[PDB]
Design an enzyme around this catalytic site. Structure first.
Site, short mmCIF file in Angstrom:
data_model
loop_
_atom_site.label_atom_id
_atom_site.label_comp_id
_atom_site.label_asym_id
_atom_site.label_seq_id
_atom_site.Cartn_x
_atom_site.Cartn_y
_atom_site.Cartn_z
N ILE B 14 0.80 -1.22 0.00
CA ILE B 14 0.00 0.00 0.00
C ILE B 14 0.84 1.28 0.00
O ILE B 14 0.40 2.31 -0.51
CB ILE B 14 -0.98 0.05 1.22
N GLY B 15 2.04 1.22 0.57
CA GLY B 15 2.89 2.40 0.61
C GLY B 15 3.01 3.06 1.97
O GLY B 15 3.32 4.24 2.07
N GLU B 39 10.65 -1.89 9.34
CA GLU B 39 10.44 -3.33 9.30
C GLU B 39 11.81 -4.01 9.21
O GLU B 39 12.67 -3.58 8.45
CB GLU B 39 9.57 -3.73 8.11
N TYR B 57 5.57 -17.37 0.19
CA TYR B 57 5.01 -17.32 -1.15
C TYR B 57 5.31 -18.59 -1.94
O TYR B 57 4.39 -19.25 -2.43
CB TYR B 57 5.49 -16.08 -1.90
N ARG B 166 -0.16 -0.53 -6.65
CA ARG B 166 0.96 -0.24 -5.76
C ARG B 166 1.84 -1.47 -5.62
O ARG B 166 3.03 -1.38 -5.31
CB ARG B 166 0.46 0.17 -4.37
N1 LIG Z 1 1.28 7.68 -2.15
C1 LIG Z 1 1.84 6.99 -3.17
N2 LIG Z 1 1.60 7.36 -4.48
C2 LIG Z 1 2.16 6.67 -5.49
N3 LIG Z 1 2.98 5.60 -5.42
C3 LIG Z 1 3.24 5.20 -4.11
C4 LIG Z 1 2.71 5.86 -2.95
N4 LIG Z 1 3.17 5.22 -1.84
C5 LIG Z 1 3.93 4.24 -2.24
N5 LIG Z 1 4.04 4.15 -3.62
C6 LIG Z 1 4.82 3.15 -4.45
O1 LIG Z 1 4.38 1.77 -4.17
C7 LIG Z 1 5.52 0.94 -3.72
C8 LIG Z 1 5.11 0.09 -2.48
O2 LIG Z 1 4.87 0.92 -1.31
P1 LIG Z 1 5.60 0.69 0.12
O3 LIG Z 1 5.96 2.02 0.65
O4 LIG Z 1 6.80 -0.15 -0.14
O5 LIG Z 1 4.62 -0.03 1.00
P2 LIG Z 1 4.56 -0.80 2.28
O6 LIG Z 1 4.78 0.09 3.43
O7 LIG Z 1 3.28 -1.51 2.40
O8 LIG Z 1 5.66 -1.78 2.19
C9 LIG Z 1 6.65 1.90 -3.40
O9 LIG Z 1 7.88 1.30 -3.85
C10 LIG Z 1 6.33 3.18 -4.14
O10 LIG Z 1 7.12 3.34 -5.31
O1 LIG Z 2 3.18 -11.56 9.50
C1 LIG Z 2 3.58 -11.17 8.37
N1 LIG Z 2 3.50 -12.06 7.31
C2 LIG Z 2 3.88 -11.77 6.03
O2 LIG Z 2 3.76 -12.64 5.18
N2 LIG Z 2 4.39 -10.51 5.74
C3 LIG Z 2 4.81 -10.22 4.30
C4 LIG Z 2 3.98 -9.20 3.53
C5 LIG Z 2 5.03 -8.60 2.60
O3 LIG Z 2 5.30 -9.41 1.46
C6 LIG Z 2 6.28 -8.58 3.43
C7 LIG Z 2 6.47 -7.31 4.30
O4 LIG Z 2 6.44 -6.10 3.50
P1 LIG Z 2 5.40 -4.85 3.78
O5 LIG Z 2 4.31 -5.33 4.66
O6 LIG Z 2 6.11 -3.74 4.41
O7 LIG Z 2 4.83 -4.40 2.49
O8 LIG Z 2 6.17 -9.72 4.31
C8 LIG Z 2 4.51 -9.53 6.74
C9 LIG Z 2 4.10 -9.82 8.10
C10 LIG Z 2 4.11 -9.18 9.05
C11 LIG Z 2 5.17 -8.89 9.88
BR1 LIG Z 2 4.97 -8.16 11.68
#
Ligand SMILES: Nc1ncnc2c1ncn2[C@@H]1O[C@H](COP(=O)(O)OP(=O)(O)O)[C@@H](O)[C@H]1O
Ligand SMILES: O=c1[nH]c(=O)n([C@H]2C[C@H](O)[C@@H](COP(=O)(O)O)O2)cc1/C=C/Br
Ligand SMILES: O=c1[nH]c(=O)n([C@H]2C[C@H](O)[C@@H](COP(=O)(O)O)O2)cc1/C=C/Br
Lengths: 325, 315
Positions: B14-15, B39, B57, B166
């Site tokens: 989600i970002g 994280e 996965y 995203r």
């Molecule tokens: N507000 C936003 N608008 C556009 N693209 C975004 C935004 N936030 C994140 N992204 C894009 O989506 C990708 C995944 O978001 P990310 O910050 O890594 O999410 P998460 O916290 O769930 O890991 C990022 O690499 C970024 O390039």
């Molecule tokens: O319990 C989990 N299980 C999982 O598969 N994941 C997974 C979900 C994602 O692929 C990755 C973490 O990246 P982001 O959540 O920042 O995008 O690990 C994460 C958690 C939580 C950790 Br607390």
């Protein structure tokens, strides 16, 4: 309203007879009903923990590994899964009990006439979260990947835990059993528990980071001895290599330079915190259940006591009776 | 002095990270006013030997190809899913220790995801979708440690069609649709728990069936509501036959478990933050919330320590 209790956790290897000897202790002292409370192993949950039978699964998985019905790489992960099942029951309980324990830092306004109420328990949580999982690793049946989740997430242990490790002669232990009878695992299990004890004592004086940099990493040669000779000897003043830290020095937990990674360190800290609180005792089950229990009695005076609300003891009893039901 | 513990959660991809950082760059004008904890990928991608992520996965890919029994694929999943727990827990547990439980601009320490993500949100989503066996829920849900006062859970949310860009790991509606739903429930559960006990309309809660799970994978039903009812929570997903006995009563231990699980979630102060816009806004919005969050107290000295530790492991 206070009154001092005696928390006694009876552990050790399996099939040894620590249950028929823990019961024979309840019959010849529970002359006065409200003086003792027993808590037995929760097989009812292990044999039906949310759907799976932890026990069958941990063994069946090995049989399934030998027949090649499954990859040895999976068989290890598969094991970790089942092994973990044993945790919850014992933990839900222990965690509740710690809540009914009075952690009052103060003087006594009055004393209680009666003797201390002893609440005996079958096995302590560390058996599921540290002794067995670690034995599986050493024997090669489980992947280290699951150690952090069990060893480093331990909850603060309340003062007054009396760990009584039961022991039996080797040739006798191999008859109490004959589930599966394979030296390798047993030989190790026995060894591990011995280390546990040495670790507790060790931890009483020194920090885990003692001769850490003098501890050879855990190698296959080491694991080999642990499966054959029952080496690890219980000793007066334990040293880093006579503990469990000898088994925790793993490459998988250290970095490039060979230092144990940050988090994992913090973990060692809590694991230490826990084990250190404990008051270690060894009880030999190499004789008639009568003696085994009599011996245990002679130890009562050496154990560390804890304090709890008289009211709570009555509650605890009800709960314990509500679930061993 | 008083700090502000803020845990930022929600779905993945989600970002919530690039938006949690853009919040640090703008208000950390004064260095010692904010502390970020990201994280711990470094441990997930090498947790004592295995790569939790790939494993969770790959196991699914391995399930579709029939390289492994669907029965094992479930157990195998539980295994990996569990790997995510330790890191986040070692940390949180340490932090709870540096928190003063004794009876002007406050220092805010932002964190990426809260432990319940590994111990309750994800594992539960895997169950609902059918990728994991319930057998591993007690070990994660019922063994939760006492949550210290002052936890601010900020669930991030994005529009559905936008969330699917995203990301595009693996992009499959079923899991996502569910994950989104669960988090919503979480929130409803926290609120719900604030007033009523888990044993509310428990005997009015239909057990969890495949029909229920089906909706959760398709419509993103579960709606966030002012005054939540038992069926808008997570308890709707916890009423499982595998946890109840013959007569249909939740088994003793499992009950005690619900208790602690409630104990934890109830302490929390729930907040929803929309990431459906420029990171600038997302962060600005989060700022407007700072005054609504519950603050906690900690030793000025400890904060300096905490910082060092956080920096010591976030390298
Ligand atoms: N507000 C936003 N608008 C556009 N693209 C975004 C935004 N936030 C994140 N992204 C894009 O989506 C990708 C995944 O978001 P990310 O910050 O890594 O999410 P998460 O916290 O769930 O890991 C990022 O690499 C970024 O390039
Ligand atoms: O319990 C989990 N299980 C999982 O598969 N994941 C997974 C979900 C994602 O692929 C990755 C973490 O990246 P982001 O959540 O920042 O995008 O690990 C994460 C958690 C939580 C950790 Br607390
Ligand atoms: O972690 C464990 N793993 C395990 O396989 N077992 C196994 C060992 C034994 O077969 C059975 C329990 O019976 P006894 O130990 O009383 O003989 O479950 C037990 C524990 C520990 C629970 Br705490």
């Amino acid at each position: 309203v206070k009154m001092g209790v005696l928390r006694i956790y009876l552990d050790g290897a399996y099939g040894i007879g620590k249950t028929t000897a823990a019961e024979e202790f309840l019959h010849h002292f529970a002359i006065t009903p409200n003086r003792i409370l027993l808590i037995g192993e929760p097989l009812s949950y292990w044999r039906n923990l949310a759907g799976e039978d932890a026990i069958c699964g941990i063994y069946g998985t090995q049989t399934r590994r030998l027949n090649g019905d499954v990859s040895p790489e999976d068989a290890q992960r598969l094991t970790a899964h089942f092994q973990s099942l044993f945790c919850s029951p014992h933990a839900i309980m222990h965690a509740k009990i710690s809540a009914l324990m009075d952690t009052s830092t103060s003087d006594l306004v009055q004393v209680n006439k009666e003797p201390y109420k002893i609440m005996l328990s079958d096995r302590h949580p560390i058996a599921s979260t540290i002794c067995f999982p670690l034995s599986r690793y050493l024997v090669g049946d489980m992947s280290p990947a699951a150690l952090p989740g069990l060893l480093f997430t331990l909850p603060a242990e309340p003062p007054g835990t009396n760990l009584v490790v039961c022991t039996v002669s080797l040739p006798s232990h191999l008859s109490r059993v004959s589930e599966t009878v394979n030296l390798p695992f047993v030989m190790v299990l026995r060894n591990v528990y011995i280390m546990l004890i040495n670790t507790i004592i060790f931890l009483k004086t020194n920090n885990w980071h003692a001769g850490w940099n003098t501890l050879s990493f855990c190698n296959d040669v080491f694991k080999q001895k642990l499966q054959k000779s029952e080496c690890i000897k219980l000793r007066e003043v334990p040293g880093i290599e006579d503990t469990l830290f000898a088994v925790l020095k793993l490459p998988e937990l250290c970095g490039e330079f060979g230092n144990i990674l940050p988090l994992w360190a913090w973990g060692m800290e809590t694991l230490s915190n826990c084990l250190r609180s404990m008051s270690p005792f060894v009880l030999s089950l190499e004789q008639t259940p009568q003696h085994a229990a009599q011996e245990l009695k002679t130890l009562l005076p050496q154990m560390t006591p804890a304090n709890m609300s008289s009211g709570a003891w009555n509650i605890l009893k009800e709960l314990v009776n509500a679930v061993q039901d």
